[PDB]
Design a protein around this ligand. Structure first.
Ligand SMILES: Nc1ncnc2c1ncn2[C@@H]1O[C@H](COP(=O)(O)OP(=O)(O)O)[C@@H](O)[C@H]1O
Ligand SMILES: [Cl-]
Length: 167
């Protein structure tokens, strides 16, 4: 089973910490969004557009269940996977690290290299706040380790995790 399963909002660092954590442990890294596209030949948006959300979620939940059973490294979960009660069930008993972030930091990390984000309009940040409202309670539910990534370097987040995942 995975050494760690990482969950969190956009910006929390699933990609970044997933990579560094896999490197530090010397283990493989599996991202469930990439796994879905590699298993289907279709891009995530395309499955959504063509088959819709329930069908994407069904597929995602099989990819997730398969990785939990088969992968021994770090597993990074798609942001919406935890919306599926079947995914929340399958996670139980696993090491699930929830990468915490605030809406403020969240928006900043997903806001690009533009120096003035407010000029674009408030809509993206409002959608981000709403997303956090929906998702954060679910991440808290499935977590076995909660890690606050607000004003921590990726290096510091990785250390924190590694010190709490010795064998
Ligand atoms: N602990 C952190 N401190 C500062 N910036 C971070 C941290 N974690 C991630 N970021 C930055 O935010 C962006 C989004 O991170 P990413 O790891 O893709 O998140 P996710 O896969 O969770 O959406 C990247 O440019 C990354 O450098
Ligand atoms: Cl590191």
């Amino acid at each position: 089973a995975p050494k760690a399963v990482l969950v969190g909002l956009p910006g929390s660092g699933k990609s970044t910490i997933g990579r560094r954590l896999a490197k530090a442990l010397g283990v493989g890294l599996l991202d469930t969004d990439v796994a879905i596209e590699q298993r289907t030949g279709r891009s995530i948006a395309d499955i959504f557009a063509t088959d819709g959300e329930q069908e994407f979620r069904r597929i995602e939940e099989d990819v997730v269940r398969a990785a939990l059973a088969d992968h021994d490294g770090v597993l990074s979960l798609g942001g919406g996977a935890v919306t599926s009660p079947g995914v929340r069930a399958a996670l139980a008993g696993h090491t699930v690290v929830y990468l915490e972030i605030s809406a403020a930091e969240g928006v900043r990390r997903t806001g690009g290299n533009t120096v003035r984000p407010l000029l674009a309009g408030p809509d993206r940040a409002e959608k981000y706040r709403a997303l956090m409202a929906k998702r954060a309670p679910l991440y808290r539910r499935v977590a076995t380790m909660r890690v606050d990534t607000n004003r921590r370097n990726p290096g510091a987040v990785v250390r924190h995790i590694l010190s709490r995942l010795q064998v």
